[PDB]
């Protein structure tokens, strides 16, 4: 929920310009931690699933001020999609 939650050691990166490759991206994401790989769509090439070695690594990215890939801006996100929302109300009994 709140800041700091182990479970997803990956991040969703997109919004990159034309020319960017998987190898490059990874290298750029190595300044924070060890990247497993970059699964970028080949059919079209719009989004890329950036994987990380350990949970900490992925966390080091979330705790970053601003991200950029050689000037251009990147919409780096903690792979937070299709998030189910609902009024979770409940209280414990003495």
Swiss-Prot record:
Widely expressed. Phosphorylated by CK1 in the proline-rich (Pro-rich) region. Residues 9-81 form the RRM domain. It is found in: Nucleus, Nucleolus; Nucleus speckle. Disulfide bonds: none annotated. Associates with the cleavage and polyadenylation specificity factor (CPSF) complex. Interacts with CPSF1 and CPSF3; the interaction is direct. Interacts with PIP5K1A. Belongs to the DNA polymerase type-B-like family. Poly(A) polymerase that creates the 3'-poly(A) tail of specific pre-mRNAs. Localizes to nuclear speckles together with PIP5K1A and mediates polyadenylation of a select set of mRNAs, such as HMOX1. In addition to polyadenylation, it is also required for the 3'-end cleavage of pre-mRNAs: binds to the 3'UTR of targeted pre-mRNAs and promotes the recruitment and assembly of the CPSF complex on the 3'UTR of pre-mRNAs. In addition to adenylyltransferase activity, also has uridylyltransferase activity. This is Speckle targeted PIP5K1A-regulated poly(A) polymerase. It comes from Homo sapiens. The gene is TUT1. The chain holds residues 55 to 141 of 874 of the full protein.
């Amino acid at each position: 929920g709140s800041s700091g939650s182990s479970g997803l050691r990956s991040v969703f990166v997109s919004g990159f310009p034309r020319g960017v490759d998987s190898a490059q991206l990874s290298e750029y994401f190595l300044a924070f931690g060890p990247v497993a790989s970059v699964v970028m769509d080949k059919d079209k090439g719009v989004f890329a699933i950036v994987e990380m070695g350990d949970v900490g690594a992925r966390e080091a990215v979330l705790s970053q001020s601003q991200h950029s890939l050689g000037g251009h801006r990147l919409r780096v996100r903690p792979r937070e999609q299709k998030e189910f929302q609902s009024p979770a109300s409940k209280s414990p009994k003495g």
